[PDB]
Write a protein that binds this ligand. Structure first.
Ligand SMILES: OCn1cnc2ccccc21
Lengths: 38, 155
């Protein structure tokens, strides 16, 4: 059995760390819901 | 409890307490990704949450009601991933989404890597609306992980 417990509020933080790039990827989505690269 | 917010999804079929995923509670409905729970019912203290809608191809599932989250990324602004890593505190990460280019159109994508138990963490716009869930994506050349911004359809 699975259960849930609260982890925080849904809110934007102004002092948040900024990281991560913004790649353009050609992908395909199959019937099972898995993405794959083209 | 049905309080709005972000929640961990835990199990005990394995060793100790294990976090399989994350979800958001809004308007009495719990939203997570399908691969996290596989449509199984959930426990909330003394109460119980049963699946209401789900789709394996979208990799989304909702509990107690229909999908409520309908905000969309504008395609321009940066967003924040409210990551809930297993065993660690919730932490916001701001980032500029990339693009998943498919035959059916384009969807935003976030290039942030976290343990798989973070699947279901919400992605927010600057107004604080949930524009999608994190945890269904690909692995690119370098070996890092890029997740789509997976959003459902209200009504
Ligand atoms: O960041 C969520 N996530 C879901 N599946 C993953 C696989 C590898 C790294 C991260 C993953």
């Amino acid at each position: 059995d699975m259960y849930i417990e609260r982890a925080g509020d849904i809110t934007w933080e102004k002092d948040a760390e900024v990281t991560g790039n913004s790649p353009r990827l050609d992908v395909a989505l199959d019937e099972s819901g898995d993405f794959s690269l083209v | 409890e049905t309080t709005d917010g972000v929640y961990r999804v835990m199990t005990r079929r394995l060793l100790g307490s294990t976090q399989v995923g994350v979800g958001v509670m809004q308007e009495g409905v719990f939203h997570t990704m399908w691969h996290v729970t596989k449509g199984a019912a959930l426990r909330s203290g003394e109460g119980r949450l049963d699946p209401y809608w789900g789709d394996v191809k979208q990799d989304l599932v909702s509990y107690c009601g229909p999908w409520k989250l309908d905000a969309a990324w504008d395609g321009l602004s940066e967003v924040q991933l409210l990551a809930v890593p297993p065993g660690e505190r919730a932490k916001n990460i701001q980032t500029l989404p990339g693009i998943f280019k498919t035959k059916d159109g384009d969807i935003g994508a976030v290039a942030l890597d976290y343990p798989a138990g973070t699947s279901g963490s919400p992605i927010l716009d600057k107004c604080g609306r949930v524009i999608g869930l994190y945890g269904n994506g690909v692995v690119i050349k370098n070996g890092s992980y890029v997740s789509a911004i997976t959003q459902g359809k209200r009504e």
